[PDB]
């Protein structure tokens, strides 16, 4: 539903990086450059943000 | 219920047992330890000169318990070699801590 | 009266809060591995362990919220001085009590017609020493729309990463062997320079490079090597055997330490050394 | 005080007998049991 | 844990009740998994993190 607090494999805090990643995507960045500018170096941490599905917005409408 | 981690039962933390087939040979059984203590104690005993066998083993990889086997020469005994290894490891850790504190104070 | 002691040597190359890089030499790989294993699984921190929920009107269930709250890093400099809750006799758990427990509270309710975020900046402790770590907006917990509400009370305790990964202070601690690279220059002259470019282009990272100012090759940054056999398999594929050679330089390592911020990156190494001393002392023989 | 809500409008009925299962202000036949006030404890694990 | 209780009725005079129970599971030692290429299997061991073999970045 929401972004997980930590990466599954290593345990780095990523839970305060979703809206920043969406803001960088909205200003016409590639996904690799949006993750480079945000500090993620290991590919385990990058696949947490490239592959997240944000289901909380759909859950908020349908009650 | 998540409490049986580092606490042993009414057993000893370390139990000594001097085997009968080979002389100057013993097996120390340590409760609530794993690869961390066993590997450095093993590789410190190999640095000793009156140690002919040193080896550690988990009896089962899902148990938190190790067994350490030492065979010495006649110039020493297994218990002396065990205690000498442990004291050398403490003095090495103290030297390391002093070096690290000096470097951290240097970097600021 | 015998001594068989080692003397490790430390040289820090970059140090800041939450990050440390340092090279360590003249000890064994068993000691470097002991420091790594203890820093991942033995150094204690403080994290939320009990959650008591009064109102939950959000679209998320209670185990989701409790598992999210368990993984938020708190400031834990007191964790070496406080005691586990299995050892404390001055209380019953179940509330705020020094040496074993911290109480947190949270309450939120949306009244606007916009969606309200509930972050980790809404958790208020009854102890001003143990707070959430400051990094932004804060870590998201839940979102509310209108007329929904979250209200709870938490109990944060002390533990280690061997028990649950929420108590681990290391997002990633690792080391690597330091390499020793020799290039036989008497066989390096035998190669024309496009074959030298063909050799250098086989390496995945930037370990070798080509200086045409002397029309030769040079090993620059010999720590970007990753111990794959690609350049050696390339030189064995050209037939020119023994042109390069790489051996791991024994008793020399490079540590990299990152912390979640609960504790500093120097304090993690120092607490690892203290705990490893404390378990070397409790194993002794009395005799 | 066990009370029910209507899943269509939201009127808070109070059923204590076993006559029928029906709302008043709608006429529809679906009701939910309301969550009263109590504390439930969880591990954060 | 009780999630909801729903009470319904019919048009020909019949009452229904439904109670829902919520459970939360992490994988245990005989749960079943498969890739996207038909390689199914069962979980046979859960290993600690510091016992796993690691790369030069710590993955
Ligand atoms: Zn990661
Ligand atoms: Zn207490
Ligand atoms: Zn109605």
UniProtKB/TrEMBL annotation, chain A:
Any Gene Ontology CC annotation: RNA polymerase III complex
Q: Determine if Transmembrane is one of this entry's keywords.
A: no
Could you list this entry's UniProt keywords, alphabetically sorted. DNA-directed RNA polymerase, Metal-binding, Transcription, Zinc
- Indicate the family of this protein: Belongs to the archaeal Rpo10/eukaryotic RPB10 RNA polymerase subunit family.
Protein's organism: Brassica oleracea var. oleracea
Where is the protein found, in the record's own terms?
A: Nucleus
Q: Which GO terms describe its biological process?
A: transcription by RNA polymerase I; transcription by RNA polymerase II; tRNA transcription by RNA polymerase III
Cross-referenced InterPro entries, in alphabetical order?
RNA_pol_su_RPB10, RNA_pol_suN_Zn-BS, RPABC5/Rpb10
Which residues take part in binding Zn(2+) 2? 10, 42
Chief location bin: nucleus
Taxonomically, the superkingdom here is Eukaryota
Residues binding Zn(2+) 1: 7, 10, 44-45
Q: Which residues cross the membrane?
A: none
Protein's recorded name? Uncharacterized protein
Q: Name one GO molecular function term.
A: DNA-directed RNA polymerase activity
Q: Give the matching Gene3D superfamilies.
A: Homeodomain-like (1.10.10.60)
UniProtKB/TrEMBL annotation, chain B:
Asked if Coiled coil is a keyword of the record, the answer is yes
Give a GO cellular-component term.
Answer: RNA polymerase II, core complex
Outline the extent of the DNA-directed RNA polymerase RBP11-like dimerisation domain: 26-98
Main location per UniProt? nucleus
UniProt cross-references to CDD domains, sorted A to Z: RNAP_II_RPB11 (cd06926)
Alphabetized PROSITE patterns for the sequence: RNA_POL_L_13KD (PS01154)
BP term (GO), one: transcription by RNA polymerase II
SUPFAM superfamilies in the cross-refs:
RBP11-like subunits of RNA polymerase
Q: Which UniProt keywords apply?
A: Coiled coil, DNA-directed RNA polymerase, Nucleus, Transcription
Instruction: Provide the coiled-coil residue spans.
Output: 79-106
Classification via InterPro entries? RBP11, RBP11-like, RBP11-like_dimer, RNA_pol_Rpb11_13-16kDa_CS, Rpo11-like
**Compartments it resides in:** Nucleus
Q: Which GO terms describe its molecular function?
A: DNA binding; DNA-directed RNA polymerase activity; protein dimerization activity
Give a Pfam family name: RNA_pol_L_2
Q: Which domain of life is it from?
A: Eukaryota
Q: Which family does it belong to?
A: Belongs to the archaeal Rpo11/eukaryotic RPB11/RPC19 RNA polymerase subunit family.
Q: What is this protein called?
A: DNA-directed RNA polymerase RBP11-like dimerisation domain-containing protein
Q: What is the lineage of its organism?
A: Eukaryota, Viridiplantae, Streptophyta, Embryophyta, Tracheophyta
Automatic annotation (TrEMBL), chain C:
One annotated GO molecular function is: DNA binding
Q: Which GO terms describe its cellular component?
A: RNA polymerase II, core complex; RNA polymerase IV complex; RNA polymerase V complex
Which cellular compartments is it found in?
Nucleus
Q: Say yes or no: keyword Nucleotidyltransferase present.
A: no
Q: Which organism is it from?
A: Brassica oleracea var. oleracea
* Keywords linked to the UniProt accession: Acetylation, DNA-directed RNA polymerase, Metal-binding, Nucleus, Transcription, Zinc
Report domain DNA-directed RNA polymerase RpoA/D/Rpb3-type positions.
Answer: 19-286
SMART domains in UniProt: RPOLD
Subcellular location, principal: nucleus
Q: Which InterPro entries match?
A: DNA-dir_RNA_pol_30-40kDasu_CS, DNA-dir_RNA_pol_insert, DNA-dir_RNA_pol_RpoA/D/Rpb3, RBP11-like, RNAP_Rpo3/Rpb3/RPAC1, RNApol_insert_sf, Rpo3/RPB3_RNA_Pol_subunit
The answer to keyword Transcription applying to this record is: yes
Chain sites annotated for binding Zn(2+): 88, 91, 97, 100
Identification of the protein by name: DNA-directed RNA polymerase RpoA/D/Rpb3-type domain-containing protein
Similarity-based family: Belongs to the archaeal Rpo3/eukaryotic RPB3 RNA polymerase subunit family.
Superkingdom assignment: Eukaryota
Q: GO BP, one example?
A: transcription by RNA polymerase II
UniProtKB/TrEMBL annotation, chain D:
Q: Quote one Gene Ontology molecular function term.
A: DNA binding
SUPFAM superfamilies (UniProt xref): RNA polymerase subunits (SSF63393)
Q: Which Gene3D superfamilies match?
A: RNA polymerase ii, chain L
| Binding positions for Zn(2+) per the UniProt entry | 6, 8-9, 23
GO aspect biological process, one term: DNA-templated transcription
Task: Check the record and name the InterPro entries matching this protein.
Answer: RNAP_P/RPABC4, RPABC4, RPABC4/Spt4
Q: Any idea what this protein is called?
A: Uncharacterized protein
